[PDB]
Design a protein around this nucleic acid. Sequence first.
RNA 1: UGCCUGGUGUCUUGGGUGU
Lengths: 147, 133, 113, 263, 137, 506, 62, 49, 39, 32, 67
Amino acid sequence: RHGQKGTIGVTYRHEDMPFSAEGIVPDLIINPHAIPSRMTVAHLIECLLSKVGSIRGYEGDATPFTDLTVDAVSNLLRDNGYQSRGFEVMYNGHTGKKLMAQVFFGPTYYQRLRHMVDDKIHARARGPVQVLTRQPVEGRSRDGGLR
Amino acid sequence: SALFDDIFTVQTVDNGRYNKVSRIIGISTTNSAIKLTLDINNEMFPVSQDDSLTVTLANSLSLKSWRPPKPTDKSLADDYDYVMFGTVYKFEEGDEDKIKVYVSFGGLLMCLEGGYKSLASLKQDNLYILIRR
Amino acid sequence: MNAPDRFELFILPDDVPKLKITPDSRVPNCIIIKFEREDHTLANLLREELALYPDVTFVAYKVEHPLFANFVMRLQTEEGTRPKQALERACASIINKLKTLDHKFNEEWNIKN
Amino acid sequence: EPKVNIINAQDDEVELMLSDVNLSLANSLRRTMLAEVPTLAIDLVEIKMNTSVLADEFISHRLGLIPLVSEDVEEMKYSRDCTCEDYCDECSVVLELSARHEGEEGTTDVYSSSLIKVSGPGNLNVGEPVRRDDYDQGILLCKLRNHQELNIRCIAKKGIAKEHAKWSPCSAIAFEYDPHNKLKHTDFWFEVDAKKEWPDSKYATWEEPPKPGEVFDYKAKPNRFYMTVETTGSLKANQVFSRGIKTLQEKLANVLFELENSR
Amino acid sequence: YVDGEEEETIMIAMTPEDLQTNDTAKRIKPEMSTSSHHTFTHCEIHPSMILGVAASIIPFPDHNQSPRNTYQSAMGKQAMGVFLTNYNVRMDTMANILYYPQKPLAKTQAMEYLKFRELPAGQNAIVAIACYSGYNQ
Amino acid sequence: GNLMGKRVDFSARTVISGDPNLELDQVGVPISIAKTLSYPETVTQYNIHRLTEYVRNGPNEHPGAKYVIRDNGDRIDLRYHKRAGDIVLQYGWKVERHLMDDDPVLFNRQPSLHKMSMMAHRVKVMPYSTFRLNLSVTSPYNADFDGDEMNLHVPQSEETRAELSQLCAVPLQIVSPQSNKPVMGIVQDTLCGVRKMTLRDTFIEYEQVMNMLFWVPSWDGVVPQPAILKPKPLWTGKQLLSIAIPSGIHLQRTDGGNSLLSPKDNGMLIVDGKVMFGVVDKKTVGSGGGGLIHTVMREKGPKICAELFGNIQKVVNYWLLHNGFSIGIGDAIADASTMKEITHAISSAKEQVQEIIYKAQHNELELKPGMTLRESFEGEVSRTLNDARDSAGRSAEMNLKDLNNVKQMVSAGSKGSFINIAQMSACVGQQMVEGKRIAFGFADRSLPHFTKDDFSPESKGFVENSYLRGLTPQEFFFHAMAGREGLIDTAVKTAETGYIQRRLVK
Amino acid sequence: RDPTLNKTVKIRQGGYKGKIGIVKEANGDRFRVELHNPNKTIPIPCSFLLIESTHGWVPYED
Amino acid sequence: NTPIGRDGKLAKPRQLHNTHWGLVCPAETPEGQACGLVKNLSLLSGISI
Amino acid sequence: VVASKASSSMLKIDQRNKKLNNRFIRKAEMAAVEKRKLR
Amino acid sequence: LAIENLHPDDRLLLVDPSPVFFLRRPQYVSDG
Amino acid sequence: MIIPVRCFSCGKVVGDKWDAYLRLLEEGKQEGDALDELKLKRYCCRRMVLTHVDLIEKFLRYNPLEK
RNA sequence: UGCCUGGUGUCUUGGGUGU
Ligand SMILES: [Mg+2]
Ligand SMILES: [Zn+2]
Ligand SMILES: [Zn+2]
C-alpha cells in the first residue's frame, strides 16, 4: 500500500527459505534496496505495527496526523519478548547456519494486481495480415506482430 | 632460512573502525629507527600495549595448491603463535639509509622502516611473517 | 503455461543417469560428480562429512540454478586414496551415524513415553 | 557418538536436543522431515454434484489440504509405480462425501468428519481423516442452505511435500543452536548496547553464559541443537522423526548402490 | 459548510487542541509566533479528511514521499478483491475474485466508511526484507 | 506508419525477470516462445542427421521443427502431415526448426533512446513465462523488474545471424562512444556485497572458501594460500575477489590523498590481478571511466570483460547469500544526542530567518545587485533554509554507525545518497514550486490556517519534520504540491525531449 | 478415420494415472490428450489409454 | 474532469493549488496525459444543489 | 430474515467491541491530552 | 464485580510476572 | 471467503478452530486471549484467524439457483 | 471401407501499462 510494486522472481519451497528460531518462514522476500531511494518509511512502520497487533490480537490504528510514535510501538513490541525494532535472528535454509545480519521481519498487507504474465506473453512467426498494406495485424488477441 | 629477526615493543594499539583488526606500532629494542606498523587479527592473536613481540620474516616455511597441513609434517611455523603470508608491493629505496617495505597480507597491511643493511634481503615477491609472544 | 511438472524435481527419467562421474585433469586425483534430482539436503550432508576426512584435500558443491534439480560436486583426495572410495566411506559413515541416532531416539522415547 | 535428549513429548509435537552431530546433519534431518517424508492426501476429486456457492476447484483445493491418517503408508505403493490398470486398493484410498440440507430454514455446515472411507488397502491403518478427539467435528469444508447438495468422491494417493505442500507431515520445525553466541556466528545490530536490546533465547538457561574475562575460542564448532517438531496429526512426532531418519538413510544407500554399480 | 470562496475570509484551527495556548520521536507543531493572539472562527473536523477514497487506504500516508502516495492511489484500483457479493449472478466481461481475502492489520479510521473491512482486496503476508539469493533485486 | 517503421513477423514480447545465474550475453527464453518462433536451417551434409531427428520430433516436442521447405519453395506443414516419419531431407532444403540454445537474437526495450537499447543475446531455453536477464544489462536498457516488457527479434538468415553475433553482441557494447566509459557495471546487492565482502575485517573459513572457489567458472583449480596460516587458516574477502579478476590487470587509484599504508582502507591498488588494499565499491566496479571494467575491456577484450561480470557476481552472491543483509525501521533513527543537535540547528535557522524578516520589514536589508528587495529577501531566506537542512542532515549522517544498513548502502553506492538520509532522519526541508517557495494561493496567505502576511518558514512550505517523525497536515499539503509539480514536469518534458531527439536524428 | 478422436479417455499408467481427458490429435502411436484436471494438453502413447464406451472402460481396442 | 484537453497545454491548470485544500484529494491523480486534469473529491466534500 | 447462529454471534461481538473501543480509546486519549497539556 | 471493584491496594498486588489509543478491538460490521 | 484449512506460512491446520474462536469471543474473552486458548503461538497463525473475513455468510443469503 | 476444415471487419472513443 505504499507504491512498492514488483514481480515474482523465483519461488522457493518451505525448506529453502530462511527461518527464525521458532520456525517461521516468510511468504515473501523483498530487497532492502527498495527502501532508501524511495523513502517509504510508512512501509516499515506498518510492518512493525502489524507485528505488534498480530502478537497481541488487536488492529493497529494507522490514521494519519495522530499521536502515534515509533517509540510507543517499539515499547509494546519489546514487552512481548521481541526485539523492539523488529529485527530477528534468522537461519539459512540451505545449510542451517545463522545469518550474520539480522532480518527485518513481520506481516504486511500485500495486494495482487491485475497484470499477470500469462496475459501479456505473445509470440508470432507468421499469421494474418492487413488487407490494405499486407503487414502483420495489430494486437496480441489477433495474433498480431510487433512494431 | 629466516630473512629478518628482531624483538619489538608495542607502542600503540589502534582498533578504530574495525572490530577484528588492530593496528600496532612497534620499535625494535636492539635498534631504534626500525619501525613496524602492522594489521593483526584481534580474535586470534590479541595484543596489549607495551607487549614484547618476536617478529621474524621468512621467504619459505620449509626446514602449488594449498592443502591442510598434515599433523606428521613439521615446518618453521611450529615455533610461533601467529603466521601470515603476503606479497611485497613496494620496496622504497629511499634516502641514505631509510628503506620502507610495504607488505599486504590479503588486505592486512604492514610497513617496515629500517636501515638498508637490515632490510637488504627483504627484496622478495612474497614474505611470511612469524610472530611469537 | 510454461510451468514444469512438480514431480520432475525427484522423478528420474530412464535415459538420465542418477550419478555421472568425470575426472578433473587440471589437478591430480580429482573427480567431478554430477547428481541428478538432488539438492542441498544430500549435498551439504556429504560435503560436511567429507570435509573432516584427513585424506580429502578439497570438497565442494554447487547448485547451478534453483529451477533445475541437480548439483555438481568436486572431490580431490590424497595420492594414496581414490576419491570414489572416500565418497563411499562418507556415505557409510553417515548411514551408521543415522542408525545410532535412530536407536537412541527410540530408547529415549520409550523411556519418556 | 551422537546423542538425543528429549525435553517434552506429545502425540503432535516433540521438543528434543541433538548433540555430537554436525550442523549439516541436523539441517538435513530438518529438511527431510519438512519435505521428504511420505504421507497420504487427497489427489483426485470427482464431483458428481455441487450446488453450493463455492466453486468446484475451490472445494477441490480445500479437500486436498485435509490431513489423513498416514500411519501405514510405507506398505502402500506410489501411483506411478503400480502396474495395475486404473487405481487398485494397493495404491489409492477412496473416500466419499455426501452432504445435504433439509428444511427451508437454517444453514448446514459440512465438516471433514463426513468424509467416509469406502475402499483402501486391507487391514492398513490409512485413509481416515485425522480427528483430534472422538467428538471433534474437524475441518470446516463448506456451508449449505436449503436445496443445496454436495456429492463428491475423492481418491487419496501417497506423495511427498516436494510435489505439493499438502503432503507435508510437519507444520513448522523450530531449529536453534548456540543461544549465547559463543561461536560469533551472528553479529548483533544495536543502538546503545547490544546485550540489553536483544531478548534472551528460550534455551539460554541450558548453556553457561560466557565469562567476562573469557577469550574467543576459534576451535569451537556448533555441538548442541535444539529443535521442535510439530505435526499436522497425520503422523505422530516420533513417527515423523524416525521416518525422516529412515528416508535420509535410504537416500544415502541409493547413492552408495549407484556408486558401487557404476564400475 | 464553507466553499472555496468563503474560506478566504475565515481563520481555521487544525485541531481542537489549537484553540488554547523534548521528545525525539513526536512531531513538532508550528510555533505561530508572528501573531500575539488569535481569534479562530472554525475548526477542522479531522485533518485526515482531506484525502480521497483511494488515498484513504494508505496507512501512515504522512510518513511517505508523496509520489509514492500517488502511485499507490493508482495501483489500489487494480487490486483484485471482492467487488460485489452477487458476483455469481452477474455476467461481466471480466471478473477477478480472490479466494481468501483478509482485512489489513494496520487500518485507518476512514476505511470504516469505505467498507474495506467487509470487501477487502489483499492478504497479510509475512514479509522479510533481505538480500537472500539475488533473485529479488 | 508503414514505410519508415512497420509491424514485423518472427518476434515475441513478455515480462522480464532477473537471473543472477546467467552470463552477461544470455537471455532466458520460455519454452512456448521457443516453440512458436523458428529459424530456417539449410540442410547440408553436416547436419542432415540432426535435422532428420528434429523433423521426427515434430512441432510439439523440443527440440523440434515446424515446417520443411523444398527447393521450389513449397512448405510442408508438420502439424497436418500424417507421414512425417516418411520424409527424407535432400540437400538444399530448409527446416524451420525450433529456437535452440546459443541462437543469437536481437533484444530491445522501448523507448530506444540510444544504440545500447538493442543488443544481441544468446538464447537459453528455460521454464516459466518471463524473459530473464543478467542484472548488469539492466542499466543500458533502463529496465527493472517491476513489470517492464521487452521485445525479441529472431534473425532468419546466415548473413543476419553473423551480423548480429559480430556487431550488436552484448560484450562488444560494454564501452559506449558517448562518454568513452562503460555502460554496464556491478549494481544493486552485488555492489553492496562486494563492498561488505572486501572490508578489512572479513575472514572466511576453509570450507566456505572451497565452495566460493568452485563457484568461479574460470578458476584454475589452485587454492590460494590463506592470509593467516596459524593458529587457524583464514582467507580475506580480497583474496576471493582477486580470484575472480584476470591476471595481468594493474589498477591504482588515490582517494583523498591517502598514503600507501591506507589507514582508512580507501584508494585502490591491484597488482597482477590481486587486490593489495582498498574497499571495492562503485568507484572501482561501477560504470565510471578508468575503473576495473574499463581496464579489463581495454586490456583483455570483450570476452574476458563479459566473463568478469559473471565471476564477480557469482562469488559475491554466494557470499552474501550465506552472510545476509537487511534494513529495518531502526536504521532511520538517530539517538537523542543527535536529535537535540538537529533541533538546535533548525531553531537557529528559523531565528536567522526571523531576523532577516525584521531587517527587510525595517528597510535594513542589503539589496543584491540586479534583484529587487523582495527577490533578494526570498533568495536569502531560501539559502538559509537549504543550509539548515544540509547541516541537520550532516549531523544525522555523522551520527550513524558503521553497522547502519542505510549507511552501508549509501557508502557502497548501490542505492541512495546523503539527501535521503537527511530527509528520512533529520529534516525534509523546504518545498519549492516552480523554483520558489509556496505562493500565496489564498488572499495573502498560503492556507486558511495562517494569518495574513506571514513569511515565517513554516508558513511558506518548510517541512521541519522528517519522514520517520511524520508530517503535519500543512507540511503534508505543501509536500504534495511539490510532488505534483515534479510529476507534471516529467510528464511534460518527455514529449519535448522526444521531439528534439527525432529532429536531431532526422 | 481415427474413431477415438473427440472421445473421453482415462490414463492407466505413467505419471497421470486415473486422469480423465479428451483426445485431440490422433496422428499415430502418440495421442494428444487435454486434461480436465489442469489446463494443459499432453502427449501419450496409445497403450496408456482407456477409451470410454457404453459399458465401462475399454482398453485400446475401441 | 477538466475539459482543457491536450492541445495548448500548460502546467498551471495541472498544478495542485492552495485552494484545493479540503475539496479535492492531493494524492490521487492519473499518470501521463491526464495528470492533474482529473480530480477526485475529498472524503467530506459536497456539491451545492 | 432468520439469521444464522454465526452471524448473530458476530453481531453481538461487534456490539461489545464497539462499546469497549468507544470507552477505552476515549479514556486513553483523555489521559494523554492532559499529560501533553501539563508538559 | 470486576477488577475495578477490587481495592486499590489489592489491585497493586496484581503485578505482571494500560490501554493504548492506537490498538482497536477488531469488528466485523464496521459502520456507515 | 471461508476460513483457510492451513496457515499459509507454516502449515498448521487452523480450519477447525473458527467455530471455537467465535464461541470464545461470544463469552467475552478478548481476541488475544481467545487465540491463546486455542494454542496459536506463532503470529503467522494468529493473523490467519484474526484477519479472516467471513464472506460466505453473504453469499448464502442469495436464493439457490436450483431446487 | 466410410472418411477430415484453416478463413477473419473497419472506424472512432475511453480507460489503463512501462518508461
Ligand atoms: Mg519499471
Ligand atoms: Zn494399483
Ligand atoms: Zn502458521
